Amino acid sequence: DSPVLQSAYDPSGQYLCYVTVALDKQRVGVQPTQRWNENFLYLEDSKLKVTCLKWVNVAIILGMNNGEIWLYSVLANEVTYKFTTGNSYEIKDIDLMGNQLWCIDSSDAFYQFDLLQFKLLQHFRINNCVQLNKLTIVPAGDSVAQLLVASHSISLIDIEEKKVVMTFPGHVSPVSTLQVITNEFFISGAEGDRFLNVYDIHSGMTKCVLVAESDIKELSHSGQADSIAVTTEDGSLEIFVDPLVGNKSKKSSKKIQIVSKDGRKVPIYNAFINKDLLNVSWLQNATMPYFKNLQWREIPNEYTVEISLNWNNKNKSADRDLHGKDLASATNYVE
């Protein structure tokens, strides 16, 4: 297990927000990936937990188990506003496109919010949707016309119809990622699963199934299906190059690992891949996040980053020499 309960890069990919626990209370911190900040937002209640975290375009909206969504401004280090649903059911997932903010409760009830007006526009529940652990609102024009939702299968709903449109056979386990790579192509991954299914929205057929070496915890897609970097549960980063071009099942091409000079392996918990640069993130000490930027195009297939970590470090004081003799003191005469 990892101290970082949740993490997410910003859309531009230069800042990482991560939630961790201090004693019994969760604290939310933000770090600059490109290059320390001591400021965390602390949840005053031990019960209160962060279920979701989504970057807003410098605000981050956090889904809570209390049943309300907190809009958090990093600069002021305080919650500017809290969107509270009428119910107390915990938020499973959230998504944003401009003013449009959509979320879902543990009661399978959809909600819509407006950031500019700070108002709950509409709430509804759609039959045949017994569980809802993922919500992704499809990028059509400048408005929301359909939503991708998945619990163990995957479904497509239209807002104005308030009804399902198409259903895709999903994984056995709960769906953990439901990102949309391009039009009529969205990827899906499940908890404790090494397979990523690519589905066609318009038709509904499994185009491909990308296979990772170990369980998948995060996923980042580059450009428009150019590359897909998936963080494995064992701490290694797999990159899929041109996943959309035997053909049904594809494996990763490049693998990235981190290992210390002494020999210990350091797991990777998140990664970002934009055009040709890949950002890797790992934890040092207990919870401090460290980063590294690399150009994955030139990296060999199996590449292991080596980092310097303290291990049996002989402690050298600047005021003493190797033998403990003070630097200021003069050397005595010995025949």
Binding site: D319, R320, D326, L327, A328, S329, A330
Partner: protein, 64 residues
């Protein structure tokens, strides 16, 4: 260098310094450091001053 404890009239020593002590100071809100000026009177041809900043906790040269 002798620190005279005035409560009990005792004294702590730091011997074998590089030169004779021209000036003594306690530097810090809490007396963290001792700044000494040393003279090295062996050389009569010149006055050779050396500035020594010691750590009060362990009397080790912090900066010479």
């Amino acid at each position: 260098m002798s620190l005279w404890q005035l409560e009990t009239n005792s004294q702590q020593f730091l011997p074998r310094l590089n030169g004779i002590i021209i000036d003594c100071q306690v530097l810090g809100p809490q007396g963290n450091y001792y700044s000494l000026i040393l003279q090295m009177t062996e050389n009569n041809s010149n006055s050779d001053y050396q500035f020594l900043l010691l750590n009060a906790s362990d009397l080790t040269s912090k900066l010479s």
